[PDB]
Amino acid sequence: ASAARRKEQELERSQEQALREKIDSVLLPILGYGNYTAQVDIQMDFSAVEQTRKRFDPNTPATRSEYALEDYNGSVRKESTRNFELDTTISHERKQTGTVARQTVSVAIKDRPMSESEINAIRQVLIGTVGFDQGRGDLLNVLSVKFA
Amino acid sequence: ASAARRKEQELERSQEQALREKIDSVLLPILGYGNYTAQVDIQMDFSAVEQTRKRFDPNTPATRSEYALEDYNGSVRKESTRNFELDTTISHERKQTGTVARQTVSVAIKDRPMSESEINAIRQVLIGTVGFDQGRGDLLNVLSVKFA
Amino acid sequence: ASAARRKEQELERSQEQALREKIDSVLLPILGYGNYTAQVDIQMDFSAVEQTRKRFDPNTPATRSEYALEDYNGSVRKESTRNFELDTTISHERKQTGTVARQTVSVAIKDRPMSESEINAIRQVLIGTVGFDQGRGDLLNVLSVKFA
Amino acid sequence: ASAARRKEQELERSQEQALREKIDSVLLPILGYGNYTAQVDIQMDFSAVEQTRKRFDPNTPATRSEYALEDYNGSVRKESTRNFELDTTISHERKQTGTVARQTVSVAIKDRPMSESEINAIRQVLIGTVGFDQGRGDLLNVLSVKFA
Amino acid sequence: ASAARRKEQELERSQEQALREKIDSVLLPILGYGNYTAQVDIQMDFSAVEQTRKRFDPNTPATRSEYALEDYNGSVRKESTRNFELDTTISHERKQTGTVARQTVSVAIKDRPMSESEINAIRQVLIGTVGFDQGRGDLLNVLSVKFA
Amino acid sequence: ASAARRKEQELERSQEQALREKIDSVLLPILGYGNYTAQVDIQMDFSAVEQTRKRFDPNTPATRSEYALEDYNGSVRKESTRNFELDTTISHERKQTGTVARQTVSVAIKDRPMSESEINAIRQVLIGTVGFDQGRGDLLNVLSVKFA
Amino acid sequence: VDGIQAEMRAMMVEATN
């Protein structure tokens, strides 16, 4: 199984490399060659979830058989027996093993600095270039630093 | 199964490449060569959902057999027994494995900037060029940036 | 099994080496050659967790059969029998063996010192370069020291 | 099995050697060649823990069947029978055999002494260079001594 | 089995030799060649403990079935029957055979004597050089004696 | 089995020889050649203890099932039945055969006598050189005698 | 033991569903 773990590491590294390639394909025309640096971290879960759900519909029952005895005298006896049929959904789901659980991307732009408007524009391009998903916990940093 | 995961990555990359090709086929005449850059992120779910639904119709029962005893004297006894037949739908669905769960497209247009009207027109063309589906969670960014 | 433990050590060292390579790929342009030193510690758990969860939904029961006797005279007898159907989820999860439980990264920058703003900018780049995850217990130190 | 114990000793020594190599890779640029000495002690547990946990959820029961008799006359009799369904988690964990239970690192720096600020900076670099974990019981000493 | 005991003695002697090597690697630069002497005693237990623990959680029971009869007249009868489900942990541990139960290290430093501060500094270096563990019963003596 | 007893004697003699070698390695630099004499007696037990312990936890019981009848009239009847589940530890230990039950070391130092301070310093070095364990019943004598 | 067997039976129930 350790060979499987090794190949999982290979998958994660391949994903990171592909994302880096896309980042380059976007930023190389916009910024130029050597005016930026970017690295990508991709964390992938490899669990084996397998779920079975059996759901009913309480608010729409359908009476199948029914008995109702109601006699008076004073005495009032109200017996009743009822059998129901209910909407039944049975869903069996099997999640894919390797899923990107969190994605971190950081891009540093060489100074000569960059204005806030262009930094936010680059961030907007990257959002969509990488597939930024904040609800997944992903993080995207864009900074303007001084290259040596 | 890790080979299957590798081929799933290949499928996702192929989808992204096809969408990029369509984006180019639309924008190359409109904008020109080298006046734009665009990248596409496609996230695909590969679950194995398999659902079985059994639904009834509570509001239209059909009486199959019926017994009704109603005697008086004062004393009033009202016995009743009833059997019903109901509309029964049984649907077994099996979803396709790989489905595009979210799609992100970002396009950056070289300045010399672009007016808001033409930006929105390009966005309208892309909506339909790519098959934008906001209800799916898809995202489409169109920006006017300064190429270096 | 000790061979398996040896290969686990190899996996941990490989992960550390990859993270060091990424750190170099980010900092070598920004800082230069020989102006920094960085080391990475990665601790990986290799447990064999395997969980089975059976969850219900108490607040949405669906009555399947029902009996209700309610007679008066004074005397008031209220007998009742009820059978329910409940939403039932059964999920079997099998965690991946080797998972990064804690990650420690330390970077030391050669003086001639570095201002706090640039130190924090480098820290921001590293956050995303390495995939910093404070909730996991990870730690990232960036210091400005005097190289000999 | 004594051969297994011998190989466990080999594993511990290999871990110590790797940590020493990392310490050198960090301190050799910062301090220089022959200006420091450091040794590492790693204690590793090799137990064979294997745990099975069966946990319930007392505060969210779901009633499956129910009987309730409540008659009056004075006399008040309240009989009741109830069956419940509970959330059931069954997790089987198998810990990895060899785990670092305690780690001790000591570093001695040649005088001409070292200021407290630089000693603490070196300590901060080592924390992260080695993966210092105080909660595990690890210990890290950094001293400035007079080499002969 | 006496051959096994012989190899256990060999293991203990090997551990002592390794610790002596580490002591030399630390003290030879600091003190010099022939200015110190040190010997190490390592006592190792070779029992075959194998423990099975079955633990419950008294304070969080979950009621599975329940009966409760409560009638009045005066006479007050309160019958009750209750069945519970409890958190159940079953852990099977198998300790490693040979474990260092006590460690004794003594170091003697040649006079021309040594000040208390440097003696304590050497003691601090050794703590971490050897992995001093007072809670285990280990003992570390550092003395300044007159070599002949 | 008498051959086994012979090899046990051999083991004891080997242990004594090793301890004598360590004593020499410590005292030869400190005192010199021919200025001391030391002999070591090691008594080793070779029993075959094999223990099984089954321990409970009286103070934390968990009620499994429970019945409680409590009626009044005057007459007060309080019946009760209770079943418990208890923490259960079952440990099977198998001690190693040959263990040093008592150790005796005596060292005599040639006069021209030795001061009390240096005698106690030599005793401190030996404590740790040999692994002195008073709680085991070990004994360590250091005397200053007149060699002929 | 018994608890592990119960877990296996629950996994079998999952597979059947």
UniProtKB/TrEMBL annotation, chains A, B, C, D, E, F:
Location in the cell reads:
Bacterial flagellum basal body; Cell membrane
According to the UniProt entry, which residue ranges have a biased composition of type Basic and acidic residues? 5-15
Q: How does it assemble?
A: The basal body constitutes a major portion of the flagellar organelle and consists of four rings (L,P,S, and M) mounted on a central rod. The M ring is integral to the inner membrane of the cell and may be connected to the flagellar rod via the S ring. The S (supramembrane ring) lies just distal to the M ring. The L and P rings lie in the outer membrane and the periplasmic space, respectively.
Which family is it part of?
Answer: Belongs to the FliF family.
The free-text function statement in the UniProt record for this protein reads: The M ring may be actively involved in energy transduction.
Protein name (record): Flagellar M-ring protein
Q: What is the lineage of its organism?
A: Bacteria, Pseudomonadati, Pseudomonadota, Gammaproteobacteria, Vibrionales
Q: Which gene encodes it?
A: fliF
Q: Which residues of the full protein are shown?
A: 255 to 452 of 580
